């Protein structure tokens, strides 16, 4: 069909919509509140204990940056994907773990201090050494340098906005732990309005509902990526003979990945008109990995009942 750009187009106002800015700022505030509530239920003792024993940190790093980009490259090679799709899936695989991974860790409730130290060290290591692995694994795709286009200020900004609420919660619990129920109720209400806000988003913010015309095989690989990540994390944890507490948290931290940086790099590298439904692909990937997370939540609770 020769080489033509997709008919998918974005509204001119979408670049600086006040509604989009309001959604971004309320999402940032929401992440701040949920991170504060999440770091409330941790203490520095286990943080220091897990930092002194970096075996879990080492296994998480070797799973996230050693095999995950390799399996992303292999999956792109075997499914005969296009250059843009292969680059997108490779960047998604190379991404470090996100904060929603820590939210699912709270849902599973296993070794939260290890989870937070894992995610902060993963983000730091990503910042340090993601462009080199991206250049190594992107031979034949995007001959451009791309080193100066991966976000750097965004990474440190996210790291600070994650660390500060956690430290605030830890120091609040350590020094004066008498206002627990109020902040937990605030967590419940922030979660409720988060459900309301995500419903509002999915209703009146997506637009151009043509994601179903997206290629089924890229849907299949976006489906398989979180599942294979979860399975690889679980087995790699199992064969290194640690305690049973860390299995689920390390496996599901390895499986989950961030998608904001992938969207930013795809948007800055290519025009919106060139990219078709792959622009909405990160949203689909995040939604489906959340679905897998909920499925494993249900499986874990069903197992623990029996």
């Amino acid at each position, epitope marked *: 069909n020769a080489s033509a750009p997709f008919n998918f187009t974005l509204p001119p106002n979408f670049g600086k919509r006040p509604t989009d800015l309001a959604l971004s700022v309320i999402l940032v505030f929401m992440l701040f509140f949920i991170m504060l509530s999440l770091g409330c239920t941790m203490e520095f003792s286990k943080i220091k204990a897990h930092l002194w024993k970096p075996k879990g940190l080492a296994i998480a790093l070797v799973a996230q940056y050693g095999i995950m980009p390799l399996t992303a490259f292999v999956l792109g090679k075997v499914f005969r994907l296009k250059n843009i799709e292969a680059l997108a899936i490779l960047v998604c695989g190379c991404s470090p773990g996100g904060n929603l991974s820590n939210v699912f860790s709270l849902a599973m409730k296993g070794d939260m201090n290890l989870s937070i130290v894992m995610t902060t060290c993963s983000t730091f290591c990503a910042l340090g050494m993601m462009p080199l692995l991206l250049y190594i694994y992107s031979r*034949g795709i995007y001959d451009g340098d791309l080193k100066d286009k991966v976000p750097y200020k965004g990474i440190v900004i996210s790291l600070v906005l994650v660390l500060i609420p956690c430290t605030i919660g830890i120091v609040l619990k350590s020094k004066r732990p008498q206002y627990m129920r109020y902040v937990i109720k605030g967590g419940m209400i922030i979660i409720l309005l988060c459900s309301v806000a995500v419903t509002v988003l999915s209703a009146i913010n997506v637009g151009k509902s043509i994601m179903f015309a997206m290629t089924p095989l890229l849907i299949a690989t976006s489906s398989l990526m979180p599942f294979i990540g979860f399975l690889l994390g679980y087995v790699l944890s199992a064969l290194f003979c640690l305690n049973g507490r860390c299995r689920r948290t390390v496996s599901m931290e390895t499986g989950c990945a961030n998608v904001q940086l992938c969207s930013t790099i795809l948007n800055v590298a*290519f*025009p919106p*008109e060139v990219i078709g439904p792959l622009f909405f692909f990160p949203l689909l990937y995040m939604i489906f990995q959340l679905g897998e997370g909920l499925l494993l939540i249900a499986i874990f609770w069903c197992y623990e009942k029996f």
Partner: antibody
Amino acid sequence: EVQLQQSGPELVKPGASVKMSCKASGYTFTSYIIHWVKQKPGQGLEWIGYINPYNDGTKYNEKFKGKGTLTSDKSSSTAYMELSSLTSEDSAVYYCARSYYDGIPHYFDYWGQGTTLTVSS
Amino acid sequence: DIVMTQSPSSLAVSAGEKVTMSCKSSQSLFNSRTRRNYLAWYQQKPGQSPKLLIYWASTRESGVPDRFTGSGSGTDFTLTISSVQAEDLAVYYCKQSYYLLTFGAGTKLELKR
């Protein structure tokens, strides 16, 4: 359809800086990249480099590192190419071509009328 | 780098004869991930800018006559005209874009006497 419009013939001294203008207004200028091809008389085509107007990303051929300089203007939908280092043998015909670029430039479907440059006294 | 070599580089044919040029490139410029076989054939009539004929070394650009067929894989490629006419006399380059944009030496078409 769309056509690629060249600046026109240019006559320049051996020591000077010459800028070439290539204009195309038939599509979204940021969706495609613009290449430059140098053709000495009867010596065949030779690639120079391409520029991506969306992010102002430029890639150069091996020999054109010293003199190759590509700049683009989104507002004017024009691509500019500058040499700033000229010799008597540098005179040739330069073409600007448009190619779709996803990860690798595919093929130059459309070409300009060409620019003839002469270097002498 | 990749260097493109064309063997004939010069030939003269009559109306009925077929030319069947061939340029062997340097190595196997076939993409395993996407079975596209990156290659493009261009035609440049004298005093005119080059015109694209074949892309992906197998697919012909719309608007070209059906007589222009290109078949090849790996390193060997061939463009055939079959029933060549008087307006097909030009220079063809079989440009490649697998790794770096390099053009071939070129072939010249003439008329026999």
